[PDB]
Amino acid sequence: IQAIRKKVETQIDDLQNKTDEIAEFNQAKVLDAFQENKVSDFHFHPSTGYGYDDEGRDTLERVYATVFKTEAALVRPQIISGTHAISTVLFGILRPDDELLYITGQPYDTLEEIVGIRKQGQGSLKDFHIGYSSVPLLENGDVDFPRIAKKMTPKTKMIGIQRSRGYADRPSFTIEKIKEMIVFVKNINPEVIVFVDNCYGEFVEYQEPPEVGADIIAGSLIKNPGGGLAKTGGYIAGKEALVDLCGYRLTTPGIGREAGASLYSLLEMYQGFFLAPHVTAQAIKGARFTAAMLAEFGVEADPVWDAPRTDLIQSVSFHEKMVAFAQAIQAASPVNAHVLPIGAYMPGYEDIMAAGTFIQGASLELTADGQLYVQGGLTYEHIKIAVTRAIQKI
Amino acid sequence: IQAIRKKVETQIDDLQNKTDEIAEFNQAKVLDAFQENKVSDFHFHPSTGYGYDDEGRDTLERVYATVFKTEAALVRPQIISGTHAISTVLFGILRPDDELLYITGQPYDTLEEIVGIRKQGQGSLKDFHIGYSSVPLLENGDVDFPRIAKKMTPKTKMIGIQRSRGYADRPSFTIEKIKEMIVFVKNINPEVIVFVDNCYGEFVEYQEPPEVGADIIAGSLIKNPGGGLAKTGGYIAGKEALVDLCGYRLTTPGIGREAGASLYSLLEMYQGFFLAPHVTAQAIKGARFTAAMLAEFGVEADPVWDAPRTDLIQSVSFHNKEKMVAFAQAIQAASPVNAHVLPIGAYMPGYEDDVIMAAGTFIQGASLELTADGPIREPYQLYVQGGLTYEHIKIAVTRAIQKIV
Amino acid sequence: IQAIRKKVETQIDDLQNKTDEIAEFNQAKVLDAFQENKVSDFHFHPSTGYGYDDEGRDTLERVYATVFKTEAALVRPQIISGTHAISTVLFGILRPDDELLYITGQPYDTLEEIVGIRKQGQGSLKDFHIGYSSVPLLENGDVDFPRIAKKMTPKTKMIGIQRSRGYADRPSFTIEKIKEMIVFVKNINPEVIVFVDNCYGEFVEYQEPPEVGADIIAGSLIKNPGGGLAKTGGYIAGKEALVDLCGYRLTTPGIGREAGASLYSLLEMYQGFFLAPHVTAQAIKGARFTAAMLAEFGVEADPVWDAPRTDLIQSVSFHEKMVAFAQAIQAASPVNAHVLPIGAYMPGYEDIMAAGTFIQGASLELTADGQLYVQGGLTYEHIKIAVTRAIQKI
Amino acid sequence: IQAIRKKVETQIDDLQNKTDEIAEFNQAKVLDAFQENKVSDFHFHPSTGYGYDDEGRDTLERVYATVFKTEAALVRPQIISGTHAISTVLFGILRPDDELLYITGQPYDTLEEIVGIRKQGQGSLKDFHIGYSSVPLLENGDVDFPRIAKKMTPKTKMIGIQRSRGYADRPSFTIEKIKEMIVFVKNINPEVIVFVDNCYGEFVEYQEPPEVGADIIAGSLIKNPGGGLAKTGGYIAGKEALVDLCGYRLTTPGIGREAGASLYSLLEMYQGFFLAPHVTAQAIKGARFTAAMLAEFGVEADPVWDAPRTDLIQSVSFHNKEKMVAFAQAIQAASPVNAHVLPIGAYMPGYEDDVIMAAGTFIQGASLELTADGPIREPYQLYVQGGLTYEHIKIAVTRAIQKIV
Predict the structure, then answer these.
(1) What is the topology classification, in CATH, of domain B1-47+262-405?
(2) Has domain B48-261 been given CATH number 3.40.640.10?
(3) Can you give the residue ranges of every domain in chain A?
(4) Which residues have a Cβ under 8 Å from the Cβ of C210 and sit 6 or more positions away?
(5) Which chains touch A (3 or more CB pairs under 8 A)?
(6) Which of B20, B31, B363 to mutate to test binding with chain A, by most A CBs within 10 Å of its CB?
């Protein structure tokens, strides 16, 4: 009903305005990154073959490095997903006898395969004699500092930090919480490399992990940083020598990041990055609206409408009952709205994905998969319409 | 200053909210047009060669027709600009001895060569013995209804209506005003064809001209309906019989709109149209912000922040050349592309005065993106409009003000 | 059988070598056109929006103008076919009360609609008070000079000449024959504009029509000049003022040829044009092979294996009997070889098209439509394989 | 002179005909692989995002697998060069404590950093405790069979075979020679994996290495199999189990080859592969023409015009720096792109001597197109090879000869 919406929208308005203040601040950050890097229409021209001397590619990378406050970045179609970006960081820096310690609990399913927990013999970190372990989180979702200290050894080269919750039933970690865990691990071993899986958190806060001490980060271009325009990809941002090592893994030793034809992907990647702060804000404002609206009809939601926000994720715990709502999201989507989803094989996961989008699997666009994790939306308007209609079914 | 912004943003907030209500209504309209036409990822596939049976292309046109409430539409990368879409409408429908009557005064100057009022032998309406004349507007900007009646004759096949003011010193015409003039010309001749140049007006109001009686409309995809994503293009929407004639002009007679490969443009056109209501709202909210901000520093704004809105146009008159040029430059300096390439007064072919143009955009000449331009002459009126995000506009305009205040 | 092929290939070899001499000469013509125009990788960059100052587009046009020996050219995706290019020439130059006289008989069907013979009221030349008539050919296929003289009036602004036969049962006109008719009409009225529909004839001979006196020519990019790489389009080449008039028709008066975004079509158009002489040669050598092979099994063919060649067209008069051969060509094609064609609606024609190609409707690729008109083939090898298999069925 | 050309072209004509017989056989092989896999225009459609269930991509790979007579293949724009395809094969299959043995002598220098013989800590085979060594060739260029037997051990998981000579002073290895060495290593260990770097050898002979026993091969799409149309890419073909491991290395473990959007590259890859046998023949016929022409003017050619051919490589040794540099320049001057940008001896990272490179091509670094390069030092050997048409090669080489004779 309209009445409820006037009530709910009035209620969340001061928090929507704060989100718009962050949006403006992050629009300026990015706008100034383009200015500092002298972005020109010349930087959108395609490169072919080996891709040597592609200034457009190099300049996009420098723009990302400036926004994320890192010395360098790798932003390319050659990186095919968020997972491939993350995996490029792990094999790029880790060597036989090194250990990787995930301090934020067990990471999202697909990493289980990359590290070697599942799918042994396929070229995982274990297959190359690189160790891995994770530190379970406490009952309330905080990290376990004394156990973290106990599991760091002289062979611990890297500390992994997953910012966003994914499907975990724990809260996503805010920048401040990440800073706290970074100060802790660096106190114990100042030479340990801190890596943050940053997916879904780009532009949600004023800061990103490198400025609070992360050495290297990675993420997906079909989420926040793509602005809904990047057709594929991932990014890596961090210290120069670490990005160089990622590049030798992405291509080959000797060559590295100097090669890789950009083809026709530059314009959209630049434009998308420029739009990212604003589109991320739409997703966050829609998340708050969704959280608030679902709460009105009794549905459990997490984070609640007035909770701190660090990423795009919004869960809505029905705990079948949800079927009419996830399918309802697809039905309020622009693409394949008539193709009602169901449970099926999702490559890299052992276990109803609403994905009526312009780009296959992109999730900065309105999506719903599950307690349905209902995130994204390129416009605040689309999210309000879709959620209002989905609720009006359930 | 941030304090002045606090005042202006709170002052204009009720109207920014009204704009967002329109954006949601227009987002739903488009979202439901996609769903009615069963848009699938199958419709983004490229076509090569002749482009026959390109379902993606034909579906996009049906989506446009549904949103605009017309029987048909022609939306193609082959239409190279808004002007090319309008000219296609004019030559597609008009034949020797027919007369076209523009009732909203003299149209934007590039239609001059198309109708035959400037240059000779280039293949204008005059070269093909098609007549043209415009009815001047009354001193306050309203149409002159008695003269409209006087100038309509049995040879009048088409009535032209330019919605947006462009550079003309007159208010843009709201849907309500456009409905008024449609009712008037239809009462004189129910079979006269009414055409509305709809550029910059798309999604600014709840309605478009066809639903208030317009027979056919045209526009540019590098403005409102492109959503900032369309790289080129134009659209034509209206009665099927008329759209078919437009198609024979755009390609050739016989074949018409059945032909035309889409190549790689479908995705951006669909996505751009879906984002159009929202992006248009950003442009409108930034215009109101520019109008209210500039008024606080004693600079004349037209339209004023609380005026009704039907298109994206927004000007500020500085009455000082140095301030106009510095503001324009400051807009370029606050744009994402070529921000380091500051404009100056340049010679424009055909005009006696220099023009200044801030256009640091992703797409060349695209105007749903933030731009600033105007002729260097009294009253030193700069058109500061467009913007893909309300954020970019606020940042750019706040900085531009800091340069000249 | 292999034996027959050794016999037939030996027989046509001196004529295949002559075709390769023309190919080399035309490869040099084009190579030197690129050199004279300083073609650089900079000329392949995409333009967006209005397309103003697109040097890549302008340079491609100048390269075509140099190859065809004309002052200027219009080569763009904005021209959607050979017919649209031809029609742009007719409406571009003709005005009310002018007459167009086709001296090579009735042109290909679709032009009937453009001129106004069929489809009246759709914006044809007649609808804009431009007259048209054609001069029938003599029983043997030669033009009728005394009748041509009789039908030229003081209102005749343009003389149309269709080089290729199309579906007509007459021979295609060689450059020499075209020169003869040009000298004749210019003797009668030196101010008459000569226009040649040049489709299928590009690079088949040492010369093109402008060098023998044609004022303006037009053709299709999905035939000879595209090299099999152009995804769509047409071209117009001729005197500067005439090309300017074509441009005002293609876009609008005032603007003209200075506008029209190139998007991603430049690289393929350049590369295709560079490959055109060589690919055209493959098509001609395959035509000769086909003509020779069909004659071995008694099938009437025209032109015969040893006839003069001016275009890619090869007819093979069975006069049902042909069904197993046109469908046989599709079945020896790389794309949709399993989709056996049949008779159906061909937009712009009132009356079994084999079109298993990379580009929809492209005919520099091996195609067969009908007396089956069997032309094209991007490689001489493909044509030999396809024809040998098609014959082995019939 | 035209007279010398008359002599050379008639002299080499029987062999040019042999090359064309191979081209027709190879054109039929590919044409039948398209037909076996039911290639439709549906397979050229772009995929975005994750690229899951991209039938166009999966079908192209099946087409490659059919042509190469392997169980599977990986052909992707994500493979950025031939070197990247080979490295993907090496890291995809090798694990700590395994040893790779190159039996055709020291491979092309960029594999040095990949195996760990140059540079440290970049993530080479050595950094992951994978062993490597090469068996030098006998003085005449044949492989050293006794040493091959000696160096193979229980740790030897893979045998490397570089078909093309590259810049090495030794003949390229024909399919027949490659079969000989495969039989030899398989007789020592039937389970040893045989890998063949197949670059420049595609469609030059009737067979490829897998059908003579090679377990897996790799190459570059900007060489032979690209047909001059592929803008970037690499391919890997071989046993399914091995191709799967390569896929996990190229993307990530678990996911592997199921992921990777094709974007806009499918059409050119299919069309390029279809044209590959024919374009390769142009390159081979031009090489023979260059070899015979240069021999007539007293310039040493290697290979000679009547030598067997297994790859596109062709060199001419001038024994004079000025002639080598002028010839190379003349090749640039006779190329379609950047013909006005003449090369000179340049510094190449890692090498002590200057290198000269004529590369006026449509695609950057593409070598199925006509190029000319070599180190500036005795015996002043220039590699003049590739060419999309036999016509371009004849024109360019005839002109280059006129500059130095």
Answers:
(1) Aspartate Aminotransferase, domain 1 (3.90.1150)
(2) yes
(3) 1-47+262-394, 48-261
(4) C68, C69, C70, C216, C217, C237, C238
(5) B, C, D
(6) B31
